[PDB]
Amino acid sequence: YLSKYAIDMTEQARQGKLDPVIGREEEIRSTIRVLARRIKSNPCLIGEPGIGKTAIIEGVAQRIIDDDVPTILQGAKLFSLDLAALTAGAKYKGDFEERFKGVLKEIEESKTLIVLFIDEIHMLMGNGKDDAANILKPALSRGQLKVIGATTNNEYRSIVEKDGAFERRFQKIEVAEPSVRQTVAILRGLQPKYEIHHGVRILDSALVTAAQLAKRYLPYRRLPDSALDLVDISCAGVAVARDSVDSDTISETAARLTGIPVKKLSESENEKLIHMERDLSSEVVGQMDAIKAVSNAVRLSRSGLANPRQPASFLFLGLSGSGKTELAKKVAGFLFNDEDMMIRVDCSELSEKYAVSKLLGTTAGYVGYDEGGFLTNQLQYKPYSVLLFDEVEKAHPDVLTVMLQMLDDGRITSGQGKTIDCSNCIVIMTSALGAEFINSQQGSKIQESTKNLVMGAVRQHFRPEFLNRISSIVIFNKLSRKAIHKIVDIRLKEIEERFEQNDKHYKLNLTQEAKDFLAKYGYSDDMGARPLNRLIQNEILNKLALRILKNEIKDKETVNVVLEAEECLEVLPN
Amino acid sequence: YLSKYAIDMTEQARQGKLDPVIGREEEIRSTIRVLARRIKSNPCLIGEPGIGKTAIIEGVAQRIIDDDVPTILQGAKLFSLDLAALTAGAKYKGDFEERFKGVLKEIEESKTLIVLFIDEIHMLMGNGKDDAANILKPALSRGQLKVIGATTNNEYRSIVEKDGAFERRFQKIEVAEPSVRQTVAILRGLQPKYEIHHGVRILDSALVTAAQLAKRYLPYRRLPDSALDLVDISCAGVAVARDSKPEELDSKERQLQLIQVEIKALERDEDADSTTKDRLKLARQKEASLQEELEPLRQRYNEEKHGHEELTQAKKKLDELENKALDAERRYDTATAADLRYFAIPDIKKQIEKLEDQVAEEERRAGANSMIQNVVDSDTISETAARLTGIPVKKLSESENEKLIHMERDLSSEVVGQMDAIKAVSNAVRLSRSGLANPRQPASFLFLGLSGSGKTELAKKVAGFLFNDEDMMIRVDCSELSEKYAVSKLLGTTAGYVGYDEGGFLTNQLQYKPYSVLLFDEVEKAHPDVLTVMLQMLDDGRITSGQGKTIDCSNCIVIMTSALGAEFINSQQGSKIQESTKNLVMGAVRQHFRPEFLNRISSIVIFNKLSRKAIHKIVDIRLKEIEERFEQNDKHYKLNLTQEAKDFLAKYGYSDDMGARPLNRLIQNEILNKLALRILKNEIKDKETVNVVLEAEECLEVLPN
Ligand SMILES: Nc1ncnc2c1ncn2[C@@H]1O[C@H](COP(=O)(O)OP(=O)(O)OP(O)(O)=S)[C@@H](O)[C@H]1O
Ligand SMILES: Nc1ncnc2c1ncn2[C@@H]1O[C@H](COP(=O)(O)OP(=O)(O)OP(O)(O)=S)[C@@H](O)[C@H]1O
Ligand SMILES: Nc1ncnc2c1ncn2[C@@H]1O[C@H](COP(=O)(O)OP(=O)(O)OP(O)(O)=S)[C@@H](O)[C@H]1O
Ligand SMILES: Nc1ncnc2c1ncn2[C@@H]1O[C@H](COP(=O)(O)OP(=O)(O)OP(O)(O)=S)[C@@H](O)[C@H]1O
């Protein structure tokens, strides 16, 4: 067997239709340290899939065919003849190894000094630890020549990396995530031929952009692949458009994944974090301090002093006035524009300081399921979520402490091991029980004595590391009387859009006197604070239904109409 | 290859007969752009099957054929195929990958960017791993030519789970489905093609509105398909309706045969002399005469029907050419407008809608053609749906709205006073159905406190009122395990893990009755994995399932069940409930599922203890109840002593907890076998009444004779 599943290349390097992309040369030089390397003749290279681990090996050939490098190994076999020949040898069983053995003689004793390479070590050895690919490999490898595979790390690879045939054999030397600046030098070097065969012409600055931005925000698809897409994405519009710019190639992409790039293309970071801050003021008023308290490590977030792995967040004081938990996540969204952030864990099951039920729960060693599948998964999902807490934590101090780990420091104690990060994750434990002392309010604001003390009563309540680090504060005077009121127009403008504003432009009117009557009643002293939404909607939504029933009128309206006496009964006519 | 059977239609699609699918362009456009990708151009779209989809590819193929593009791109053509054809349609066993080998250079020889493809074929994978052209898959990249297949969502994952590099060497996009309404514009625009098939008139809105409940009444035909079926079935009820005068075909024709044989068979006959010939003459007279009034008349229908079918063929004609006329654009600009001018059309349609105009204009007596050939608004559809479903104009004719507005008074008529409970829900429901919640937000609530309470029935009946359904029904076990819901909810086997089952009551039919009943049960019951799913299950826009991995929550009905009124019931001393009892009731569970879900709750509101002036009615159903349906009038008798009778068992009736539910069984079984007795002998078989008399509790009751 000769050329069939093989990658005949060095020629395609020697004739050179290959397009050089020159990455990190070191591990190659490291790899070059193979040529006569013996004891363990080779390392490996472990990336995630998309990184050109072999494009390296391709670039290696560029390091090779171009010669003027060590000719200690000079004559060449680089070519990977596996493919699927594993099962794809013939019409029946047993020839897989033949399929390589049919390779063996047409690969017989080496004139050409160059070891070749097959893909993964798990493309190597077929399934792994199977006869496929001549499971035992001194005799050729210590023998005519060698080969190389490569993959991503641990488990499947680790198993055969412990002993098997690699007991004597290769290490792994792993290029990084494609780094910062070169990536345009990459990209711009990618430019000329790739961009020359892509379309039109081009200029720098945009090239910088998604580079940053794929690097940004884009752990999945971190690789230029998207730019490489953006590349084709680029010509996509215009070359078409010309058949009959601004990084706005990136825009619709950044529209695609973000939902608008004006979300992604957007407040840059830091001033704009502060602009974010003032836009969160724009969001919700109430204690500016609360805002400002929340504003604190905003700047410290992502900027770092000791680590970004610092958790930066604004420890919550459990209560719900307006933005409260909600906007706290909304801002947390309004950080990343992503509302979704993190869920809540019911701490009910968490009652003790231990259970099989924990945010980790199981270790994944033995039968069961993952408890707290969130950060199990939520990071598998997503970086930089909100968090989840309770005014009485019924949670296990275990994890709380195991998160006091992640609490004080940044990296969290991954139960299964893999603090994939704490980078942008900045969130604040939400607890307070002092409601009856929280009940201490007069006027629009509270002077602090109580707020020291139940604080104190809590300050020592659950032990200090909790209450030790992580400054910022959350304060509740609630709404005094009106100020919340503006929420209505929100509440209003929560309406029309949700489906289509088109449905009803009718936009009505709120007759503050009602909104008073609405609010004054409608939401408790304590809270009672949701329903008027859930409510006033209705009797109105009746008219909605109603005026949608027999249907004489269509307009954009202003309602502003109202009369136990507890009901003056708003309504609205045609 | 020719042997490999290019399905190239770009020829017939040069002839352009299969016609311009619309709306996914933008995708396609960009997808096309994707299909032009410098690096890997091969995505797919995935989802529900069949239907508009290859048509996209075709529509794609159109814009392809439509030329103007980046240079490379119209340097292409295509084909499609089946090796499924060529499976044995090529050769003897072993040839799966066979002809690809030709295809290889066949591709690579001189060939421009021409691309055959077929869709799920890319699955290959009868079972396990085929990989033949997956061998070629790199050899594709070797071949350096796009091809693309298409599957559902369902497959490729497992496949890419098996393959990896597959879509790693590919891309995707996905079925968005057409825009429900605007779908019709196409469908509208489909008519001009589609009409001509069986040419008739068309009334739009029906079709649309048809599509609506077509979709509604039959979801599980995909957004076009169901219409396409209408579209079809339209032509169907049309079809023999385009048999000329099928009734008046055989109806009046008889007048011949009626009087025909006797034209001679009386000529010789044993009758009174010469009156034989008289009846032979006088009916042949009416045979001659009466024939005449329709004798040209039936033709001039059919004539002008032909005149339709004449013009219909011009209707048939015009486009054909117009197609062909616009294929001469593939003749470049040489024959673009040249022919396109020669076809004129100032008039060619000014011909058309002014031609059959008159005969459409002229109404015979009324309605012009009994051919009626046109959209027949539901009718056909009704019939369609009928043939699909049945049940009449009530089921078939409705508005929302109008369908809705009264429901209460009906719903009132259905069970209990609960005017509020009615009203609340009603509204809530009405208010649901209003500008609604968007499919994402669902519709649910709860009563409590009693069994025998009919709120199910209510809802059940509401579903009737909604869906005509007592058909759509859900029974949610909850308490029945904590570790439960393998079966019930998604779990079952949701991983394809072991022994595949899941959504046991649910997933199985869950989807396939999109139109929602649903339950929750008597209390917190067993387990929070409710809260788990009931999160999603309530959570707006819930999409999950086993391996379909999707709820698609549109029709949103559970409301739900639960109850504990134990004290509260008994606590309640009167018909209407005592205030704050509810509040006392409130905390009960609402502590459990907590504001997050309390918010997540739409609302929950419960039934009274409504007793007797109630029951004074309520009993009433039972009589009417059967009778109301019963059979269809075997003999079918009024049979009642009513407030006399009924009360007195209504006296027995109320079980406290259960009411007469047993008595429901126990009422009639009394009366019944006597029916057989009153079936047998010495009887009176009309509608009669009951008898009721009195031991102390032991009471005569029984029946007339
Ligand atoms: N300067 C460079 N040096 C080395 N490799 C590069 C360079 N620029 C781009 N590449 C890689 O070249 C690859 C060519 O495609 P493939 O290698 O098939 O995809 P890949 O997944 O990156 O390769 P693997 O999986 O890492 S071996 C791209 O995916 C890039 O990751
Ligand atoms: N402008 C606002 N005014 C009042 N409440 C708001 C406002 N914006 C959001 N919310 C609330 O944000 C809540 C989510 O955060 P939480 O702090 O948990 O509230 P809560 O603890 O449920 O008690 P509430 O919100 O005061 S009734 C929702 O219940 C909303 O009522
Ligand atoms: N002008 C049009 N605009 C939109 N859709 C159209 C148009 N004309 C036809 N269709 C749809 O095209 C489909 C018929 O082509 P199909 O053969 O079904 O494509 P496809 O083969 O169904 O995709 P697959 O292969 O079945 S999964 C029907 O669903 C029609 O609704
Ligand atoms: N007109 C009616 N009004 C009230 N309840 C009725 C009526 N007709 C029948 N029912 C009973 O109401 C029950 C229907 O379920 P629901 O609406 O939940 O009330 P429920 O009785 O609490 O549920 P059950 O009795 O546990 S099945 C059945 O027991 C029916 O027999």
Summary of the model, kept short:
Chain A is mainly alpha-helical. Chain A has helices spanning 10-16, 26-32, 53-65, 85-88, 95-106, 156-162, 182-195, 204-215, 225-242, 248-258, 261-264, 270-283, 288-294, 296-300, 324-336, 373-381, 397-408, 435-438, 450-459, 464-468, 487-497, 512-522, 532-547.
What is the topology?
This is part of a larger assembly, with two copies of chain A.
Chain A: H1 10-16, H2 26-32, H3 53-65, H4 85-88, H5 95-106, H6 156-162, H7 182-195, H8 204-215, H9 225-242, H10 248-258, H11 261-264, H12 270-283, H13 288-294, H14 296-300, H15 324-336, H16 373-381, H17 397-408, H18 435-438, H19 450-459, H20 464-468, H21 487-497, H22 512-522, H23 532-547
Helix pairs in contact in A: 1-3, 7-8, 9-10, 12-15
The structure holds phosphothiophosphoric acid-adenylate ester (AGS) (4 copies).
Strand content of chain A: under 5%
User: What is the oligomeric state here?
Assistant: part of a larger assembly
* Largest interface (CB < 8 Å): A-B, 40 and 35 residues
**What is the H/E order of chain A?**
HHHHHHHHHHHHHHHHHHHHHHH
Termini distance of chain A?
86 Å
Shape of chain A: elongated
Count every helix of chain A, treating DSSP H or I runs of 4 or more residues as helices.
23
* Helix share, percent of chain A: 25-40%
List bound small molecules.
phosphothiophosphoric acid-adenylate ester
Main sheet of chain A, how many strands, which sense, barrel? Answer: none
Provide the gyration radius of chain A in Å: 32 Å
User: Quick one: how many beta strands of chain A?
Assistant: 0
Secondary structure class of chain A reads: mainly alpha
Motif (Nuclear localization signal) (chain B): 608-624
Family (chain B): Belongs to the ClpA/ClpB family.
Region (NBD1) (chain B): 2-246
Modified residues (Phosphoserine) (chain B): 41, 141, 370
